[PDB]
Scaffold this active site. Sequence first.
Site, PDB file in Angstrom:
ATOM      1  N   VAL A 110      -7.664  18.445  27.590  1.00  0.00           N
ATOM      2  CA  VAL A 110      -8.949  17.816  27.327  1.00  0.00           C
ATOM      3  C   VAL A 110      -8.957  16.331  27.673  1.00  0.00           C
ATOM      4  CG1 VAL A 110      -9.420  19.465  25.488  1.00  0.00           C
ATOM      5  CG2 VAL A 110      -8.296  17.290  24.965  1.00  0.00           C
TER       6      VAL A 110
ATOM      7  N   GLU B 271     -10.640  12.187 -10.051  1.00  0.00           N
ATOM      8  CA  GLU B 271     -10.014  13.015 -11.073  1.00  0.00           C
ATOM      9  C   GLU B 271      -8.738  12.385 -11.636  1.00  0.00           C
ATOM     10  OE1 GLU B 271     -11.253  15.143 -12.570  1.00  0.00           O
ATOM     11  OE2 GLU B 271      -9.859  16.454 -13.494  1.00  0.00           O
TER      12      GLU B 271
ATOM     13  N   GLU C 240     -11.802  12.820   0.940  1.00  0.00           N
ATOM     14  CA  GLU C 240     -11.123  13.631  -0.069  1.00  0.00           C
ATOM     15  C   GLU C 240     -10.097  12.819  -0.881  1.00  0.00           C
ATOM     16  OE1 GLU C 240     -12.196  16.118  -0.991  1.00  0.00           O
ATOM     17  OE2 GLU C 240     -13.347  16.961   0.585  1.00  0.00           O
TER      18      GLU C 240
ATOM     19  N   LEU D 162      -4.160  20.884  24.153  1.00  0.00           N
ATOM     20  CA  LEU D 162      -4.784  21.478  25.329  1.00  0.00           C
ATOM     21  C   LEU D 162      -5.315  20.435  26.311  1.00  0.00           C
ATOM     22  CD1 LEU D 162      -6.771  24.315  23.534  1.00  0.00           C
ATOM     23  CD2 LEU D 162      -4.712  24.574  24.945  1.00  0.00           C
TER      24      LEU D 162
ATOM     25  N   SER E 222       0.689   4.221  -2.838  1.00  0.00           N
ATOM     26  CA  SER E 222       0.206   5.545  -2.464  1.00  0.00           C
ATOM     27  C   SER E 222       1.121   6.638  -3.006  1.00  0.00           C
ATOM     28  CB  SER E 222       0.107   5.657  -0.955  1.00  0.00           C
ATOM     29  OG  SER E 222       1.380   5.691  -0.370  1.00  0.00           O
TER      30      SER E 222
ATOM     31  N   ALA F 287       0.826  -1.203   0.000  1.00  0.00           N
ATOM     32  CA  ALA F 287       0.000   0.000   0.000  1.00  0.00           C
ATOM     33  C   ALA F 287       0.863   1.258   0.000  1.00  0.00           C
ATOM     34  CB  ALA F 287      -0.937  -0.012   1.195  1.00  0.00           C
TER      35      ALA F 287
END
Lengths: 121, 121, 121
Positions: A50, A76, A69, A48, A17, A13
């Site tokens: 979290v 294309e 995406e 931060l 790619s 892969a």
Amino acid sequence: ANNTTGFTRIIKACGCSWKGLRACWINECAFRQEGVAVLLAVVIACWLDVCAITRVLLISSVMLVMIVELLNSAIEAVCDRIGSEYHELSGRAKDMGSAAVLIAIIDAVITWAILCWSHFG
Amino acid sequence: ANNTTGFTRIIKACGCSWKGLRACWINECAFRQEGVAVLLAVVIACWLDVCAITRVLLISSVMLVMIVELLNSAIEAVCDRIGSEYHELSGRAKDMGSAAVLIAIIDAVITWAILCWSHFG
Amino acid sequence: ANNTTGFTRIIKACGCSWKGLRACWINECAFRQEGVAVLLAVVIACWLDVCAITRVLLISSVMLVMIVELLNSAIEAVCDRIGSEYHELSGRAKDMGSAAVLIAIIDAVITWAILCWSHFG
């Protein structure tokens, strides 16, 4: 054996790619425009103070934008391999690909506000 | 009406997946190589004394690898239906498909280390 | 420049999704049949007194069903642009697309029972 070598192509892969992500950068860089841009915003929330599960859930939505995406760039790339008849043909597939990332983003934003209210602060 | 029957084909997803997953096993079995292999590793963590939300988050990344490899098998299946010109043509789409599962895995591994540090122990 | 305008098409995702989601509604409405139907069931659990992380995790599986059915509609949309030879050709891609949402649903249902046992009540 083209089918057997087709699976061998998937097995490697990383190598594959190379030419794919090459064609992506050349033809359609929404991978960077939306995919990585959103990734970087999550990196900031994660840097931060979290919660670790929020960190994971945000990265999960990042993958949803990045991957879709990549699929849009794939469309294309193949059109370029043949010509303008195909550049127009796949426009319906590309329209649905735009719808796909729109849905990923819109519902992700709902989860994002929830996560920010419960853990970001 | 081919368009109407096209939707009927989607309605009967289980039946449809018979010939699709047949062509997948024949042409590209990364569904098993990466998809199920990763699934089984999660099953082990989930069998062990861990948190129910981690169990869910790990299964979510399993679906990301399984589904993208199904899309990779789909690419080669259609190439087989026509010939070597298409086996080469879709190589760009397949390259991007490899990039897609690479991105799914790489970011998932980041979430995996986080989850293991916070709940696996 | 078709490649440059191809990226511009992605940049205007909302506009693009108009003709795509048009062809989806016309040719294959599993986006509504499974995608939104499941979404609405989650909305009910989320409206009820549950946990914010479960709410997020359920929405994540909703996106998995919605997006894959958008990809299934994309397949038939492009077939309509040319003819019956392509309506048969892509049947393998469509078979794998059915397998994709089946896998999304089956594993999601496992996570759904877990989430309902730990937070829905």
